[PDB]
Amino acid sequence: RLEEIHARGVLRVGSTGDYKPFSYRAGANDFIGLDVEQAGELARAMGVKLEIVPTSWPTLMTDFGADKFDIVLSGVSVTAERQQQALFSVSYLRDGKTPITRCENQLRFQTLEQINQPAVRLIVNPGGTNERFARAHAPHAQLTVYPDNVTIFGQIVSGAADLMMTDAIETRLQQRLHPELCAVHPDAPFDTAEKAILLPRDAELKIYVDTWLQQRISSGGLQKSFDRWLDYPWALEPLRQAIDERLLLAEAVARAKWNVQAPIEDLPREAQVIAAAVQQGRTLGLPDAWVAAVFKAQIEASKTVQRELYAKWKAQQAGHFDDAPDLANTIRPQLDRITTQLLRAMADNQATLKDTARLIRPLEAAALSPAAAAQALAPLSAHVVVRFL
Amino acid sequence: RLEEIHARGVLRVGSTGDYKPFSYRAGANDFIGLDVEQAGELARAMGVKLEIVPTSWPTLMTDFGADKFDIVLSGVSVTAERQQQALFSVSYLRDGKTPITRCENQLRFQTLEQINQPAVRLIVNPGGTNERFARAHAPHAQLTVYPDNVTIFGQIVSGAADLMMTDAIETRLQQRLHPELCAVHPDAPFDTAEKAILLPRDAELKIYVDTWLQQRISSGGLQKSFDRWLDYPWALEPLRQAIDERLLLAEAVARAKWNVQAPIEDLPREAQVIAAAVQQGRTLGLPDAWVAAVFKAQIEASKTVQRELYAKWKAQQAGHFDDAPDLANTIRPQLDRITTQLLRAMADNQATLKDTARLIRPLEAAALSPAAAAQALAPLSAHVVVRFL
Amino acid sequence: GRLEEIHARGVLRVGSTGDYKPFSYRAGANDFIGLDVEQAGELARAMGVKLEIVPTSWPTLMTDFGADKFDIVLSGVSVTAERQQQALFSVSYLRDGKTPITRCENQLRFQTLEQINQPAVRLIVNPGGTNERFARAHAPHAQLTVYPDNVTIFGQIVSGAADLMMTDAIETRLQQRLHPELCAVHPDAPFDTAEKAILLPRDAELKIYVDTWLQQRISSGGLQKSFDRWLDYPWALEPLRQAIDERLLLAEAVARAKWNVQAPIEDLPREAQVIAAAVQQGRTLGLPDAWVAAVFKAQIEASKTVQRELYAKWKAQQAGHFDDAPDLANTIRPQLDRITTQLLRAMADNQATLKDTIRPLEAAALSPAAAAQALAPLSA
Amino acid sequence: GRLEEIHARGVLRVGSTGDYKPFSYRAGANDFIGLDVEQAGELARAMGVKLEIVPTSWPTLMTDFGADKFDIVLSGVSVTAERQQQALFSVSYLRDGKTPITRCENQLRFQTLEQINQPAVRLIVNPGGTNERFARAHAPHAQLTVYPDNVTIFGQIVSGAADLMMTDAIETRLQQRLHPELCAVHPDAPFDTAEKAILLPRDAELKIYVDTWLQQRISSGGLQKSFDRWLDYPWALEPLRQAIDERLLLAEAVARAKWNVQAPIEDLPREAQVIAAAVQQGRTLGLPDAWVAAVFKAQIEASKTVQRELYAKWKAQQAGHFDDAPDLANTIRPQLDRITTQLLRAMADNQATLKDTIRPLEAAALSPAAAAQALAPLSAHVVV
Ligand SMILES: [Cl-]
Ligand SMILES: [Cl-]
Ligand SMILES: [Cl-]
Ligand SMILES: [Cl-]
Ligand SMILES: [Cl-]
Ligand SMILES: [Cl-]
Ligand code: NA
Ligand code: NA
Ligand code: NA
Ligand code: NA
């Protein structure tokens, strides 16, 4: 197998994309997380390209049998069912299952006895170890099997189920994401399992991966990676998406203004944007001085992109952009939607935004203008956020 | 002393008003809580009126020495400094100090050793046992002293301090109020203290109070009171304040409209109120159908008050109300402020509003119109809140 | 159960340290006395069962609890959080806490925890305790010897071997009476507060039972009464009683030895010497002679009653020679003279206490008549 | 410390149950052997300190840990969450878990947990264990006897007293060799998974030390090697050795008794009868007589060497009469005949195993020469 990879020139890696902090699909061709980073390092070490292949827990082993990928790096628990068809690496992590529920009912679900009874509405994603564990250790409970995820933890928030039981590390993270949810004794889970790399029945590969892993572990490199991706501000990932998406749109804004040969400064639009942001921010209890600064920065950043393009296009004496979207009817609506998103992210994650060596990953739109990207983030640096509050 | 009370005809009771669930000043002449209810029962038993006298922890004993009140019922810990000047009753409760912090950092602050070091930002209210305990058992930490005890737990939510150490029962409550906060091992506090009634140096009174208390305890009456005031929806208390204050203003609205003999229906104002509420609600992620229903009800309730008054005043041939405030300039502004408050309370406490035998205390404005009061609350009954979500 | 498990087993097992007058004192044997032993009694009666005191100590307190060696603990136990981890408590029957005890000269040297907490000062505590925890927390700079017997620990202060101890203010009220040289430091204004309550296991129905019982006792004045009794109780007399007891138990050996040589029981020379020597020694302790003579006459007559009963028994059995019987002149009579000393010193301390004024001696097992004889001149 | 406290104290204290071949077996005495005893050894050497095995058991495992009876535990301990509460673990040196073992006829009767979990079936486990927890969780309906000795528990299945046991697949691979009548049930496909690792105390510097040590051992093939050694190790011979040992230690009593009557050491009648009776009994067990005779000749000659050494010692001391010396005819010789039985049965089981292939007997304390004599005809070459 190891030769087939070297020949094909590419490591195909299964990843569910549903399991923060291991493997998350933020969109696009944009997977992030611990096990995505590791897949990266392994590819580099073999001297080949990486390809993430999407999978899911229900489809995991059938996708393996169809040879859709070479390995799976996705916070996979070593289990015996899986050992039937597959090899595993040495473990890189030790975890296992603990409950997550609304913060009121933490005491209602301390024990498997408390949990295993017909009163209780249990929820799991399908295919999983999470499904197997719920069927084995809580049969009497009422089990809905809910075939989506990231939004499965919504079902508990909204009272539609009572609790879920999942890996204690998933639970530590989801309690940060949903403040209304709480992890149940995650330092003392109900059981133990290894996390390791799913491999095919090929011993030379297993030896390769294991040697690789043991090196990474002993040298501190995995420990480092674990620190990064747990202290990673998963909560700020929407905030980042909003700032990012808004800036990338400045390209379209420029195209449209260019066609009408509008000037870049549009003082009416600036006043409205800021005035409307402040109003919306007051309803969310944000202070106005700060909201204004934030949005001033967003505008100034946009305008830097615009100015760079206008310069370029004046030099070209460029003409008319044919599939440029409408400013009033398409674009400006999108921008106003994002303003909302951005303000809400500011409102929720005021604490998370004061931590300092817990820091966001870099914007896509530094590709477009690194200067503009800096401008946009400037008033969300911890020091100014503390300055305001 | 017991005779001086009977003579004066009034029991003067210290209460800090800062310590849910014992003693809270919701405004006004409006104290509520366990120890306010108890002060009530003691007054009744002596056959006298109750007067709450405001105090605070910093002023507690000086206010006692100035004979500003007879006793103090306010979740007061028995301590030796206080025993110097004062008697105590028998205990009605046994507690003591445990940390509260963001749900992430539960594990960071399990122990006093973990807590007592210069990295950590500790916060306490002044005057207290809480201040004395933090100075004695955690000197190396950074201690900000933040002189308002109701909004102090905001400072932790918002990352401005790391944790607070306070009575484990206060911590049980504040974790319910702020879902993002979590109590640290409140079943296993760092220490123990009695809660009891602060009394003056007079033995006949002490015997009276103690006999009273022992009766209340043995008969189940205190146990009952404890159940009530812990299951009391403290979270919904602002929501209730907003609905209440808004309805009480309908009295002013009627006075003003009466002077101009305006009609009660104003369909423009109705459309604007609802339209503006829905908009604001969208920014808070409330669903619009529900916000509209809620506010329809608030309007219909206002109009019921108006109609009752108009009828009354036609019968009286009442004249002109001289100090009636301006509708456009004074009143309608206030109403719009309260709309904001009300929406935010809806946004936060969607879960709390689905619990059913945890129910709010009755509105002040049932004095004005019980029918209107019913109308206003109707679309915040659990069944309709669940119907919408 | 738990309340049912007790009713079934037919016995209430109660922890008691036996080291903490006036709550719980082990005078020997199966012979516990004090406030909390009396209370354990009343609770047993109320449940309609027998009482069994189970010995414990402060260092072993909670491990003994976890091994289910007893049902409850009644022993002047402070409510503390460590103990609340494993256990329930009753309602408090007392509110107290820690205050210093020191020699009466140095009362003013140790008014405050600042005065106390410094490296000059020699502090002493019994181990296991709240007393140990409090000394470590509130006086770390002082020099701390940990002295593992709580009854004779107050001797160490008297004798200058430590400067002070810090303990429950009620313990301090008592020990200042027992050692006239020691004085309680502001016991009406202790350094802190604690509840005393009954340690219970994690069973709510029992807690409700005990609490209802206790609240009754408190509200009716019955606990207040019990407190008055057991503080005004003449604790001073307990060594005197131990000495009379030990001396009488030796009459068994005396008889064995005399039997082997078939000596007669009455020995008028020995009687005169014993009394004469007691009186002399008593004069040095300022005891009046008439009284010492009476006391020791009684002790002699009591011894002889034991002897006579045994001689009768042994004549009937035709018992032979007792092989491991100690020598009279060389082993036994020395021991008797040692105890005479102890007995006289106990008399000398408690001359006042013996105007005010009892359960049986251990040696009522041997001869109840002799035991009566021995106590007779400590009436009145 | 902790690593410093060990270096200071000069000794590594290691828990071992002594009940779990091939990891940890207590043959007696201060005589532990196995994979994890060998490893404990290597770790001690690496720290530059002496080893002390501290006995423990599964029921007492964690309480003994909390009482600080030892530093670490190396005993084929599964990583479990209960244990993680009080304790750290090393990296795993093995991945295993539970599979059935039963008589070779009933292999097909117990393929699945469904087949196993029902009231017809007589299940057996040792207590304290993961083995007990797993049987209670995954097979409640079965009849569960809890049999508190883990070495002879597999006898109960052989003898039909229970139907099967469920235990670590590696334990099952070994016990099927030891009892030919028993068979492992799909040990390449267990019902579940667990790590084996070293139980450590809450001290991170030590954990780093042990882990670095272990990762080296693993990556270099040294643990794989050690696994091969201790599975191919002739465990069958350990009872045989116990019987030779016990029999020789009795020669001390034999001498005491003969000394009191000043009997001579050589007794050619007794020799002929011992050998004659052993051969007869051996024929019923299908042992060949020539070999049994050799073995027992050696046992006799070895006994006599002990006797001679003691007689010499006692003549020099002019020792007198031994007062609590047992009777020869009535107490001792019976015991010797009981052990002969044991010894022959151990020979009968391990005829194959005695084509392969030792440490000292306990009775080298008594006479090293005699101990050599006793073992001499169980060198391969004499099994001609
Ligand atoms: Cl998994
Ligand atoms: Cl207080
Ligand atoms: Cl405490
Ligand atoms: Cl205590
Ligand atoms: Cl006295
Ligand atoms: Cl195990
Ligand atoms: Na010290
Ligand atoms: Na005194
Ligand atoms: Na053995
Ligand atoms: Na069963």
Numbering used by the authors:
A (entry chain C), B (entry chain D): 21 to 409
C (entry chain A): 20 to 376, 380 to 402
D (entry chain B): 20 to 376, 380 to 406
Quoted passage from the original study:
To investigate the relative locations of the active sites within a single polypeptide, ∗AfCMCDT, ∗JbCDTCM, and ∗DsCDTCM were crystallized, and their structures solved and refined to 1.6, 1.7, and 2.4 Å resolution, respectively, and Rfree/Rwork values of 24.8/20.5%, 24.3/19.9%, and 25.8/23.0%. Also the structures of ∗DsCDTCM and ∗JbCDTCM are very similar, both overall and in the active site, with r.m.s.d = 1.4 Å (Cα atoms). ∗JbCDTCM and ∗DsCDTCM share the same residues in both CM and CDT active sites. In the two ∗CDTCMs, the distances between CM and CDT active sites are similarly large, measuring approximately 40 Å, thus disfavoring a direct intramolecular transfer of the metabolic intermediate prephenate from the CM to the CDT active site. Whereas ∗AfCMCDT and ∗JbCDTCM crystals contained only one polypeptide chain in the asymmetric unit, the ∗DsCDTCM crystal contained four chains; with head-to-tail dimers (CM-to-CDT) established by crystallographic symmetry. The buried surface area of this ∗DsCDTCM dimer was estimated to be 3070 Å2, with the free energy of dimer dissociation being 5.8 kcal/mol, as calculated using PDBePISA. The dimerization interface is mainly lined with hydrophilic and charged residues. The crystal structure of ∗DsCDTCM head-to-tail dimers allowed us to address possible intermolecular substrate channeling between domains of different protomers in a protein complex. The active sites of the CM and CDT domains of the two individual chains are separated by a substantial distance of about 40 Å and open toward opposite directions. An ATPase and another solute-binding protein are encoded directly downstream of the genes for ∗TaCMCDT and ∗TvCMCDT, whereas for ∗SbCMCDT and ∗SpCMCDT genes, no flanking coding regions with the same orientation were found. Interestingly, an intramembrane protease and an AI-2E family transporter are encoded by the two genes in the same direction and directly upstream of the one for ∗DsCDTCM, which suggests a role in signal recognition.
Chorismate mutase (CM) and cyclohexadienyl dehydratase (CDT) catalyze two subsequent reactions in the intracellular biosynthesis of l-phenylalanine (Phe). Here, we report the discovery of novel and extremely rare bifunctional fusion enzymes, consisting of fused CM and CDT domains, which are exported from the cytoplasm. In γ-proteobacterial fusion enzymes, the CM domain is N-terminal to the CDT domain, whereas the order is inverted in β-Proteobacteria. The fusion enzymes of Aequoribacter fuscus, Janthinobacterium sp. HH01, and Duganella sacchari were crystallized and their structures refined to 1.6, 1.7, and 2.4 Å resolution, respectively.
